[PDB]
């Protein structure tokens, strides 16, 4: 098992853990802020997903400082994880293209 694949696997696991902790910590940051919607666990999990993917519909979003901090970690984990998958696909294609060229 080559490095770029172990890392893509590791990244994906690590993102799922960030999604779960982020859901949990978002609700804990946002309860106590009047008007907040990010305040029950099921939809916080959906919110962490659509944040990690950078979709950001706008149905849900943090309004407190620490919910916004949790959001940033989730965004970075998500962009980084998907970028690491992209970089692993690059490595696979580049290796395959070496062989196909006899290099």
């Amino acid at each position: 098992s080559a490095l770029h694949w172990r890392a893509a696997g590791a990244a994906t696991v690590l993102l799922v853990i960030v999604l779960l902790a982020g859901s949990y910590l978002a609700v804990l940051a946002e309860r106590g802020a009047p008007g907040a919607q990010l305040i029950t666990y099921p939809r916080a999990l959906w919110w962490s997903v659509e944040t990690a993917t950078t979709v950001g519909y706008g149905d849900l979003y943090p309004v407190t400082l620490w919910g916004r901090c949790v959001a940033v970690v989730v965004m970075v984990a998500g962009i980084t994880s998907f970028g690491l998958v992209t970089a692993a696909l690059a490595t696979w294609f580049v290796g395959r293209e070496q062989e196909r060229r006899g290099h």
Partner: antibody
Amino acid sequence: QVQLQQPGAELVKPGASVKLSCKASGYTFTSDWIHWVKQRPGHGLEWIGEIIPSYGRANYNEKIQKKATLTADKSSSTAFMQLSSLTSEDSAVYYCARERGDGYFAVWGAGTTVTVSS
Amino acid sequence: DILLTQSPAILSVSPGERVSFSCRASQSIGTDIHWYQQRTNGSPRLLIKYASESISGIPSRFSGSGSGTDFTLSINSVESEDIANYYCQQSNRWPFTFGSGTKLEIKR
């Protein structure tokens, strides 16, 4: 099973304070919140506050004067509300309720009748 | 904070007739409304969650409908045990709030 257990009654002299208890049984999750709800005679339900025992974070109703203070004892599965400096306006039935972090109060205590008098 | 309006405060129906309780939210709250029954000297009891979802242990008689700002709790064929106060509660925005409640009264 009875999932939340509360004492039937507390009498409190005016200006004094009282700690209300709520011992939980059944399933307890890291995610569970314990809520407190006040009901004055002839009146409706009034949301007072909430605490998450696993992390110890608590929130309070702002719209009403803040006499309360919420703690939990993870070891005893018991949540406490300290109402301090009480008046006749604080005499009420105080319920505790359990919410699994999904927004509704699935189970309630029998409530503690708190009477302020001399 | 979200104000929940329950009106009328009292509802008089005849035995076995359909009855409908109204809950109105001061702004759209999706389907994040739950309904509680409180009998004389009792504590509240969850009847319906998320506007229309059945709770096991609760007679089929009870139903819920609505979304947005207008919500209804319905009893098809009232009977005496249904004599209680009925409260709605929203969990869409912090803090959770309750409606002021509606009493069911039966004209027998």
